[PDB]
From a paper:
The taurine transporter ([name], [name]) plays a vital role in taurine absorption and distribution, facilitating its transport across cell membranes. [name] belongs to solute carrier family 6 (SLC6), which comprises 12 transmembrane helices connected by extracellular and intracellular loops (ELs and ILs). Both the N-terminus and C-terminus are located on the cytoplasmic side, adopting a pseudo-symmetric topology characteristic of SLC proteins, with an inverted pseudo-twofold symmetry between TM1–TM5 and TM6–TM105. TM1 and TM6 both exhibit partial unwinding in the middle, which, together with TM3 and TM8, contributes to the formation of the substrate-binding pocket.
We employed cryo-EM single-particle reconstruction to determine the structure of [name] in complex with taurine (TauTTAU), β-alanine (TauTBAL), and in a substrate-free state (TauTAPO), achieving the resolutions of 2.8 Å, 3.2 Å, and 2.9 Å, respectively. The taurine molecule is located within a negatively charged central pocket formed by TM1a, TM1b, TM6a, TM6b, TM3, and TM8. This pocket is situated 18.3 Å from the cytoplasmic side. The transmembrane segments TM1a, TM6b, and TM8 form a barrier around the central pocket, sealing it off from the cytoplasm. Moreover, TM1b, TM6a, TM8, and TM10 obstruct access from the extracellular environment, resulting in an occluded conformation. The residues in the taurine-bound pocket extensively participate in the polar interactions with the head sulfonic acid group of taurine. Specifically, the main chain of residue G62 and the side chains of residues N63, Y138, S301, and S402 form hydrogen bonds with the sulfonic acid group of taurine. The positively charged amine group of taurine can form a salt bridge with the negatively charged side chain of residue E406 located on TM8. We replaced E406 with threonine (TauTE406T) to disrupt this crucial electrostatic interaction. The TauTE406T mutant showed an increased EC50 of 50.3 μM, compared with 2.9 μM for the wild type, suggesting its important role in substrate recognition.
Author numbering: 38 to 181, 189 to 587
Write the structure that this text describes.
């Protein structure tokens, strides 16, 4: 391990970060979490968390990676050897996230392959998967039995084929399994070979999604009924703020969308030069991420308002209110533009491009963090390609559980418990507490001043010292005191063993800190206080 290879230029670092932390979490997860919580009231805790913990923790991870010049699992050895379980917890969280983050891309691939016909299959109600209820959206207001929309019927009876419950796995769907295999093969081939920053390819891969988003926003804003959707999206409801669910959802959506507590930002920052101003760039990238999410919300809620006006029902009873809101709302939008197939193909290509870069960055970060533990064995003595192939195969086999007829429930369980929620709060709280109260805020500020050239303000120091731990602990305690079980589409109730499995998924990463603390204490010689003093001393964080 001579030295980590630095970036060729700052543009490479900026492009890598932008492609890694802007993606499906901005256009797929934000809208449905906002819709589930009623909209409007979701934006107050969202912005509170964004300006209290979101940017400061992201900058802290980047600056720690740059300072220590080490990955996301070994940097904590040079800051606080006792609290070295944070890296292991992050690697567990990223391993669990990589398994279920790709089923969305499998669904997108299915939709893209299905959009190559003369007429879109989700536009009408005369097919083998339709039910006697299916009625055209144009005729819903004209007449009147619980009618169903062709888009929802398609999504629920052709792509998913939903089962009565999680205890009814049904049979494996081979068409979705083939799409999952295809996307996993593409991901594996784009990592073993190592996709380079081709000037033309990236120039297009990083500009097409924003153009498509602008086109969708312009189309949505001119539909009849967009004003009601915008008012539903913007105006808040103070009564909803008395529940911990909205607070925890909005708080952890920021953590999910900024890719923190994952070990990926530390790895990305480890390739920076020592004398590099990585503060302004981080602020601008956070601005870009938040703006992208906020802009996409306008378009999706305008489409929802138009659909609600057309069908003649409320805006809260038009879509899934779960991980299918985008797949219900955006195809309905593209069915109204001229040449619907062209725009459908373009939209799904944009979705795939947004997802694939994030998946690439996360898997690369996980691999490079797990390799640094044994840099001798897994570099020459054993093949790195074989290790990558084994990881991909195991992840695909594990993700096969969400492809069966009853896999939506497993996907929802994974989304709620793994790589989101209490585990993210736990990791963020421990990172901030360690840095602020064991290493030293001013001690880190000296290194930041040495690296970037100027001393920052007290905002980051205060956020690390007080604001973030208080928010995390308060949200955790508020959620625990008033407990409400998880549901799917506000109607399905999970069995007890499913909740136990979800809590085990959450605890698999949360249990890594005390175990590592105990093992480190047991591996040291001498009196207890001497051992504690020896393991709280930073082992020369390279300055
Ligand atoms: C809607 C949301 C997402 C917007 C929130 C982001 C803001 C908090 C950003 C916008 C631009 C950022 C600023 C852009 C420029 C600078 C100047 C920079 O100082 C220098 O570049 C000095 C250069 C030198 O001396 O070499 C310090 C960071 C700062 C204040 C950034 C701090 C945070 C700011 C205000
Ligand atoms: C970590 C890995 C090794 C765990 C094992 C993954 C594989 C071997 C497991 C996980 C879930 C399993 C599937 C779950 C449900 C069904 C439906 C049944 O009608 C055919 C078998 C099938 C398709 C199982 C086959 C094997 C399976 C895919
Ligand atoms: C010396 C340089 C680096 C100092 C940089 C100061 C910047 C990074 C800090 C200092 C004070 C901070 C602001 C303090 C108060 C608010 C009000 C809140 O509603 C939005 C966030 C906002 C606007 C903060 C955002 C960023 C901020 C302007
Ligand atoms: C130098 C020392 C600290 C390295 C020793 C590694 C130990 C402390 C770490 C490395 C990764 C960690 C494991 C990662 C994954 C799991 C699976 C989970 O189901 C139980 C906890 C468990 C088993 C963790 C326990 C502690 C663990 C084994
Ligand atoms: C409804 C939106 C509310 C947004 C509230 C954001 C609160 C952020 C507090 C940050 C305080 C930083 C002080 C820095 C002073 C130098
Ligand atoms: C819940 C399972 C998630 C996936 C498993 C992640 C574990 C990663 C490896 C842990 C460290 C192994 C080496 C220990 C000796 C240094
Ligand atoms: C017919 C009885 C139930 C059969 C199993 C249904 C649930 C299967 C998914 C949950 C187990 C795997 C989760 C991931 C574990 C790492
Ligand atoms: C759901 C987890 C999938 C990925 C599994 C990652 C762990 C792979 C095996 C452990 C590698 C590190 C130890 C190697 C010892 C020679
Ligand atoms: C909202 C219902 C009660 C929850 C409030 C819990 C107290 C929050 C502050 C606790 C102190 C933070 C611990 C570490 C900060 C230095
Ligand atoms: Cl977001
Ligand atoms: Na991306």
């Amino acid at each position: 391990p001579p030295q980590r290879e630095k970036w060729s230029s700052k543009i490479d670092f900026v492009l890598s970060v932008a492609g890694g932390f802007v993606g499906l979490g901005n256009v797929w997860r934000f809208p449905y979490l906002c819709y589930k919580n009623g909209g409007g009231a979701f934006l107050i805790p969202y912005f509170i968390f964004l300006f209290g913990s979101g940017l400061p923790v992201f900058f802290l991870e980047i600056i720690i990676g740059q300072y220590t010049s080490e990955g996301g699992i070994t940097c904590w050895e040079k800051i606080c050897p006792l609290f070295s379980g944070i890296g292991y917890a992050s690697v567990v969280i990223v391993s669990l996230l990589n398994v279920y983050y790709i089923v969305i891309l499998a669904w997108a691939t299915y939709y893209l392959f299905q959009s190559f016909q003369k007429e879109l299959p989700w536009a009408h109600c005369n097919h083998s998967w339709n039910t006697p209820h299916c009625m055209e959206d144009t005729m819903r207001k004209n007449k009147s039995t619980n009618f169903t929309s062709p888009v929802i019927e398609f999504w629920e009876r052709n792509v998913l084929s939903l089962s009565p419950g999680i205890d009814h796995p049904g049979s494996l769907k081979w068409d979705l399994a083939l799409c999952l295999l295809l996307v996993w093969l593409v991901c594996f081939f784009c990592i073993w070979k190592g996709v380079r920053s081709t000037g033309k390819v990236v120039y297009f891969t990083a500009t097409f999604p924003f153009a498509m988003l602008l086109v969708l926003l312009v189309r949505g804003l001119t539909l009849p009924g967009a004003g009601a959707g915008i008012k539903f999206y913007l105006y808040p409801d103070i009564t909803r703020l008395e529940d911990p669910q909205v607070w925890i959802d909005a708080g952890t959506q920021i953590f999910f969308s900024y890719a923190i507590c994952l070990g990926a930002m530390t790895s990305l920052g480890s390739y920076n030069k020592y004398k590099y101003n990585s503060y302004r760039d981080c602020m601008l990238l956070g601005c870009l991420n938040s703006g992208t999410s906020f802009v996409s919300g306008f378009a999706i809620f305008s489409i929802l308002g138009f659909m609600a006006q057309e069908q003649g029902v409320d805006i809260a009873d038009v879509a899934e209110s779960g991980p299918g809101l985008a797949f219900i709302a955006y195809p309905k939008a593209v069915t109204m533009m001229p040449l619907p197939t062209f725009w459908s193909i373009l939209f799904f290509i944009m979705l795939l491009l947004l997802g694939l870069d994030s998946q690439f960055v996360e898997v690369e970060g996980q691999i490079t963090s797990l390799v640094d533990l044994y840099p001798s064995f897994l570099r020459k003595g054993y093949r790195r390609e074989i290790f990558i192939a084994f990881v991909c195969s195991i992840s695909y086999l594990l993700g096969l559980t969400m492809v069966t007829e009853g896999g939506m429930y497993v996907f929802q369980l994974f989304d709620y418990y793994a790589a989101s929620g209490v585990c993210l709060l736990w990791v963020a709280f421990f990172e901030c507490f360690v840095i602020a109260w064991i290493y030293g805020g001013d001690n880190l500020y000296d290194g930041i001043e040495d690296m970037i050239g100027y001393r920052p303000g007290p905002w980051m120091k205060y956020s690390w010292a007080v604001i973030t731990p208080v928010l995390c602990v308060g949200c955790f305690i508020f959620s625990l005191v008033k407990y409400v079980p998880l549901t799917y589409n506000k109607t399905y109730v999970y069995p007890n063993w499913a909740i136990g499995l979800g809590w085990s998924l959450a605890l698999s990463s949360m249990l890594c800190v005390p175990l590592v603390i105990v093992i480190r204490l047991c591996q040291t010689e001498g009196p207890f206080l001497v051992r504690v003093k020896y393991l709280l001393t930073p082992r020369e964080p390279n300055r």
